[PDB]
Ligand binder design. Structure first.
Ligand SMILES: O=C1C[C@@H](C(=O)O)NC(=O)N1
Ligand SMILES: O=C1C[C@@H](C(=O)O)NC(=O)N1
Ligand SMILES: [Zn+2]
Ligand SMILES: [Zn+2]
Lengths: 361, 361
């Protein structure tokens, strides 16, 4: 068929596990998974080992990413029980601040949330892992401190309808939804098993999944929440939560597009334009993705690149394939082969156009 | 000594267990405990059996109270998973609506909270059991629906500082604190035991208790959260949470007054004026309480009137004693003897001055 050209897509929620969890994934394998999924820019979460909750850990993570990343990236800082008010000099160099309100870096009191909202620079992003009533609680803190907040992986009818009500009142809140909460449900827990199927937020009911689709207008971004764990860990005694998702996100969503569940533009708003404008991420010159919307295939037991080496979407039929990715003028991916080496990717916050504009302080 | 005359005090948070739990307490014994504590008006919570979540249950509870109460009263309605939008004709006859966000009547989703805030008459009280981040979540719902909310039994530094921040922004929120969260702490769990010491909100740290005192200006009301359970239940296999408190609240607070921890006026604001104005409760004619602030005594293993027949304040030294209570021109209590019979008390919402003023609908 004739290929469809897309801009370089952005995933604002990936866990690349480097430093400290490199058997699950590292920058080189995670960004290869990204490129294979049509993603040319990722925002990596801070719950690594050591966690990115201070300047030295950020300095280390930056060098590991610059040395191992194959696509471009930005790095989140994590809010901790100790670092409120201490991140002012490095905050602008990060993708944003992740507030983990379920990895929590010791944050346990709403008063600590307030301190972070008061001290983190007001022009820079804050994203929150907040489930069920926690969405309401963190929105309240955002209002008290009169600033915006971005809600990670919305998974429930309860949560999306709450955000819907907040937007109707004109509040500055945006949100993202991950593909497993659009394409998997309780109906899949029998096949997956209790170990494999462990994820946070957990899989929703059919009614939850139906509510997210019905309220697509409320969803600002799609993001994978790529959370790689080995099969041994997912099936073991204390299964960690999370799915790998970089290599399956776009095929799943392209399938929905070909079925008329959302438009191609609807998809590009949520994987390109809205991530750009929420996180102030720069364009990528000479960067685009070529996909084939006619190719039907079945998702295998594991995708080629993620070290997780498993996938909960196994056996699902998809229509849509990433055929070629060009990143800043170089062929990065073609028909299953990655052609840019570790270290090709760059930190977008170091580009002149990647700094977040602010009033002169 | 010369006795100090106080107005008739109000406890806006009591569990009187009738109907359905009359071995723990009934209207006659609970209101005798109230009168012995200097309390002439109580607001009874709806988590009885059957719970007061519909008009027939309210009609039954009203008659049981009118037949058994020795002091005056109002009855809460409970928010349920089914009764949002169905309480319009009886709402004005209730003390208010209790939202139980820990007895929960099946409410589990923030969307259900919103429905109650949208449907309950906007001029009538809503109180919420909300702990830790739930305080923030329900405040958010109050703002979305642009109305006030009253937070029950604030127990933590985290909660009182959050409410403090909300009041600084001018939000319509009030709160109450119970005596066990001012006069007991973790330091008392060894003596109490894990069964006796079970209460929700649980006992706080020294730092929690210190924060509540330091932020007394943020506390609108004192209320006992009188939650009677028999000693057998408190010490048994599945201990229910709660303390009896009607007979000990005022002696404990009068002790703090004599120690200069708060003024007598500070006390009367929180046990008389602010309860009046938050819940639109009418004055009680020819009603007053005479106390002796010099009499020192030690709290015994159980107080005379509550069927709970135990108390977690056992062994605490207090200075201050209720000597006499007059209710609507009749001696109701004198030196340990109750002299008004069951049925003397009335439903204050049926008085002309006890209806909540509203714009003509
Ligand atoms: O909150 C999270 C984080 C993630 C991980 O494993 O890092 N995977 C999950 O399923 N939930
Ligand atoms: O929420 C509550 C309710 C009360 C009861 O037993 O009814 N006692 C408590 O300790 N917490
Ligand atoms: Zn995540
Ligand atoms: Zn209560």
């Amino acid at each position: 068929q004739k290929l469809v050209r897309l801009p370089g897509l952005i995933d604002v929620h990936v866990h690349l596990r480097e430093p400290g969890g490199t058997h699950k994934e590292d920058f080189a394998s995670g960004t290869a998974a990204a490129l294979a999924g049509g993603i040319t820019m990722v925002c990596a979460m801070p719950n690594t080992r050591p966690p990115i909750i201070d300047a030295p850990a950020l300095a280390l993570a930056q060098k590991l990413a610059e040395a191992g990343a194959r696509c471009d990236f930005a790095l989140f800082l994590g809010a901790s029980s100790e670092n409120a008010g201490t991140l002012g000099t490095v905050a602008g160099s990060a993708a944003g601040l992740k507030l983990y309100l379920a990895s929590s870096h010791g944050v346990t009191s709403v008063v600590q949330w307030m301190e972070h909202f008061e001290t983190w620079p007001s022009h820079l992003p804050i994203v929150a892992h907040a489930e069920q009533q926690t969405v309401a609680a963190v929105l309240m803190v955002a209002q008290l401190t009169q600033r915006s907040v971005h809600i990670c992986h919305v998974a429930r009818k309860e949560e999306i309808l709450l955000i819907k009500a907040a937007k109707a009142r004109g509040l500055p809140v945006t949100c993202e939804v991950a593909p497993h909460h659009l394409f998997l449900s309780h109906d899949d827990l029998e096949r997956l098993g209790p170990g494999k199927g462990e994820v946070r937020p957990e899989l929703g009911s059919r009614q939850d999944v139906e509510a997210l689709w019905e309220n697509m207008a409320v969803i600002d971004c799609f993001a994978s929440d790529h959370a790689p764990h080995t099969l041994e860990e997912k099936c073991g005694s204390r299964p960690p939560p999370g799915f790998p998702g970089l290599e399956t996100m776009l095929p799943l969503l392209l399938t929905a597009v070909s079925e008329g569940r959302l438009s191609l533009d609807d998809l590009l708003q949520r994987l390109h334009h809205n991530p750009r404008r929420i996180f102030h991420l720069p364009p990528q010159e000479d960067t685009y993705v070529e996909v084939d919307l006619e190719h039907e295939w079945t998702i295998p037991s594991h995708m080629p690149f993620s070290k997780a080496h498993w996938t909960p979407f196994e056996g699902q039929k998809v229509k849509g394939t990433v055929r070629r990715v060009v990143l800043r003028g170089e062929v990065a991916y073609i028909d299953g082969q990655v052609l840019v080496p570790p270290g090709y990717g760059q930190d977008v916050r170091k580009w002149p156009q990647g700094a977040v504009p602010q009033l002169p302080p």
